[PDB]
Design a protein around this nucleic acid. Structure first.
Ligand SMILES: *P(=O)(O)OCC(C)(C)[C@@H](O)C(=O)NCCC(=O)NCCS
Lengths: 72, 49, 50, 135, 134
DNA sequence: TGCCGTTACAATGTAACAGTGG
DNA sequence: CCACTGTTACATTGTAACGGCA
């Protein structure tokens, strides 16, 4: 499903545990993903669901909950 | 301007290729990092020299 | 005893150094290639979005 | 030369090629005598962990027939090994029915371009129709 | 069943396949102990020139997990062996650059056709476009 | 379900053509 | 000239996944 495909992408693009990645887990502070890591995370999220996102609306996404919210 | 649309499609395919390459490389690197949890990576593997 | 310990120490040193030189080289090559590919990719992303 | 030649890798490739050919039953040796051929093969086997000596063993006992096949197979293996790094440089193997392949090859030889280029042109014309339908 | 099965041929095929796998290092036999495995492999090696006994050898000592792979390999061998008689039933193998293959497979999956059918349709549409223009 | 044809690949080996530099 | 390299177009064998049929 989408709400777990997001976890599939996030865990394997940041290397963090599945338990760590909750809905409210922010990438930078909780998951530790920095500038380039978050860039690669958004690219992977785009690839998984074969869609595209605007630059500003994409950069607005900075959390698992926000990630799914834009994805779903 | 359908030619311009075709140019956009060609650039889109190139960008898809590059993004797929980058994402696959990142996933492999993350898998390796999770697999080197045995602490052989701090200095022994990442030789900045 | 001296012979055996020297042989084991030399084996350890050689294996360790050779394995590190074998792996870390490709590891750093992969890191550099990934960074370069990302730098190239951003330009295509921007132009496609425009 | 476009692809970097690595000695300690190509030597192992060559040794593996010789061993595969021998175990398949072919006469890699240039010797007609059974004893010398057996000794040379045994020495090649001993050379498993010393790929560097495989070049000398080649120059000493390799059948004169196999030089062309050797230079072909290792060259192709080098190309494939370096192309496997990225998907966009890889190759995909497909099987085609005789009529379809016959028509496609005739078309390609007519246009004087490779099969991939002909497929590109065909799919591009179809995609042009699709694009103009979309617009 | 479309292709008639011949015992003296398929049994030779099976013997050759098992010998190839053994030479490749695959564990042919179900015996973890090396002595029994070596004895069974020697029985197979000296068992050459025998269909009626290679079948029994497979039934008795064959590794359980290789049965499916061997069965499908023999299926493919039978089909190819019978199809290689006539030109029109043969298959031509080619290598396609990854982007071209990706686009072609996209079309084939989209339309539900196979690669051969997809290429046939594409060539036919190209011909029809030629006739339209001409 | 288990056999049986069929497809779409992967891996490796070769012949032939095209390039390149010594 | 000549040799060595890169590339394309096959072949050959093996395997996994579908789908038909008793
Ligand atoms: P991190 O602190 O290394 O930052 C990386 C980055 C956010 C600057 C980078 O990923 C990026 O977004 N670069 C392009 C910025 C942009 O919007 N450029 C316009 C299109 S080229």
């Amino acid at each position: 499903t989408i709400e777990e495909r997001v976890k599939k992408i996030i865990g394997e693009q940041l290397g963090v545990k599945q338990e760590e990645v909750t809905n409210n887990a922010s990438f930078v502070e909780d998951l530790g993903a920095d500038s380039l890591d978050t860039v690669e995370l958004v690219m992977a999220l785009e690839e998984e669901f074969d869609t595209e996102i605007p630059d500003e609306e994409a950069e607005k996404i900075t959390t698992v909950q926000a990630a799914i919210d834009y994805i779903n | 301007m359908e030619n311009v649309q075709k140019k956009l499609r060609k650039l889109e395919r190139d960008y898809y290729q590059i993004r797929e390459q980058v994402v696959s490389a990142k996933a492999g690197w993350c898998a390796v990092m999770r697999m080197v949890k045995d602490n052989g990576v701090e200095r022994r593997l990442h030789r900045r020299e | 005893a001296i012979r055996v310990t020297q042989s084991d120490r030399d084996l350890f040193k050689h294996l360790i150094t050779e394995a590190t030189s074998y792996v870390s080289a490709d590891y750093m090559r992969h890191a550099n290639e990934r960074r370069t590919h990302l730098d190239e990719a951003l330009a295509l992303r921007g132009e496609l979005f425009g | 030369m476009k692809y970097q030649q690595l000695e300690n890798l190509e030597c192992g490739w060559k040794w593996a090629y010789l061993i595969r050919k021998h175990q398949e039953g072919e006469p890699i040796t240039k010797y007609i005598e059974n004893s010398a051929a057996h000794a040379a093969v045994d020495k090649l086997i001993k050379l498993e962990s010393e790929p560097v000596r495989v070049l000398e063993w080649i120059e000493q006992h390799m059948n004169p027939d196999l030089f062309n096949r050797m230079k072909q197979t290792i060259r192709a293996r080098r190309k494939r090994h370096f192309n496997a790094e990225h998907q966009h440089t890889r190759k995909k193997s497909i099987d085609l029915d005789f009529p379809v392949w016959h028509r496609l090859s005739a078309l390609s030889q007519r246009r004087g371009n490779t099969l991939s280029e002909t497929i590109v042109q065909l799919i591009e014309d179809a995609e042009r129709k699709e694009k103009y339908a979309n617009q």
